[PDB]
Design a protein around this ligand. Structure first.
Ligand SMILES: CC(=O)N[C@@H]1[C@@H](O)[C@H](O[C@@H]2O[C@H](CO)[C@H](O)[C@H](O)[C@H]2O)[C@@H](CO)O[C@H]1O
Ligand SMILES: CC(=O)N[C@@H]1[C@@H](O)[C@H](O[C@@H]2O[C@H](CO)[C@H](O)[C@H](O)[C@H]2O)[C@@H](CO)O[C@H]1O
Lengths: 153, 152
């Protein structure tokens, strides 16, 4: 790509869904988390959660495509079990049955989310990203890799 | 506020709604456009448009509170008369019948929107903001003023 990237931790390969796993050392500015997978042919919804610990009470960033009402994506944060105000992008960048690349870039003030190489949505951090130590993926997809890379030398 | 602010263009004081007027010289990085006003007691919707010319066909940033379905705000861009994909924040930071301060900060890659001095939404620039030379405000509100300020 347009930036030199270096491995952080090692990839999750054909991780079975639902998948929960560590983000080693926590999210860090300049980190890129890329999921490569396929939206299932009769997909209704799927979920990527960047969370603090395993119980899902505290999800810094919930990313939830919904193949409903024309197709839209919900982004939100859960704190002490409580969902905050949703940010809905009224567009569906995934296609049922089709492969996708979904990349999450951690910046100082926001996540930037690309789908198939194109900017899709920004999400302002509501809670500290460094406290996210877990990724959880569930729903109507399959995945061939999750990789973790950084631009930081 | 936490930083000294200086006028960039004189205010529009008590502008009559619907209001359309110049943003003299176009939007600039670092400009803050502040609307001080009151949401009407039975508001349905109101609109703040940052647009290129009087026409309305090209709206860089359409900011549209809707007192509908629990309350939500629509952000979008219009290009050649066509609406792009809506960004909806499913929260209503305005109260019907109540004063508000609504502040748009032009940053290099996004607008930042503050409501009553709290961050409300960000909106990534889809077209260069400097082509915006016109503000249009309409709907269920009144304004005491619109100011244009910079940290300058
Ligand atoms: C219109 C509206 O606000 N709808 C919401 C639902 O989106 C919400 O569903 C939950 O949403 C969260 C993220 O906010 C997460 O995706 C949950 O899986 C999902 O069930 C619902 C219940 O919280 O409230 C509705 O009214
Ligand atoms: C759920 C959905 O996508 N609904 C949209 C409406 O929001 C839209 O209404 C228009 O929205 C634009 C900004 O996007 C502007 O606020 C107009 O005043 C409003 O009429 C409608 C027509 O474009 O499409 C619906 O599908």
């Amino acid at each position: 790509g347009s930036m030199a990237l270096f491995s952080a931790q090692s990839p999750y390969i054909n991780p079975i869904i639902p998948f929960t796993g560590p983000i080693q050392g926590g999210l860090q500015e300049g980190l890129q988390v890329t999921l490569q997978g396929t939206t299932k042919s009769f997909a209704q919804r799927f979920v990527v959660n960047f969370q603090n610990s395993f119980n899902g009470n505290d999800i810094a960033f919930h990313f939830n495509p919904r193949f409903e009402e024309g197709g839209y994506v919900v982004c939100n944060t859960k704190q002490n079990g409580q969902w905050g105000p949703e940010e809905r992008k009224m567009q569906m960048p995934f296609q049922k049955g089709m492969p996708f690349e979904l990349c999450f870039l951690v910046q100082r003030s926001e996540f930037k989310v690309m789908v198939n190489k194109k900017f899709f949505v920004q999400y302002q951090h509501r809670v500290p990203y460094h406290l996210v130590d877990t990724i959880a993926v569930s729903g109507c997809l399959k995945l061939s890799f999750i990789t973790f890379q950084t631009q930081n030398f």
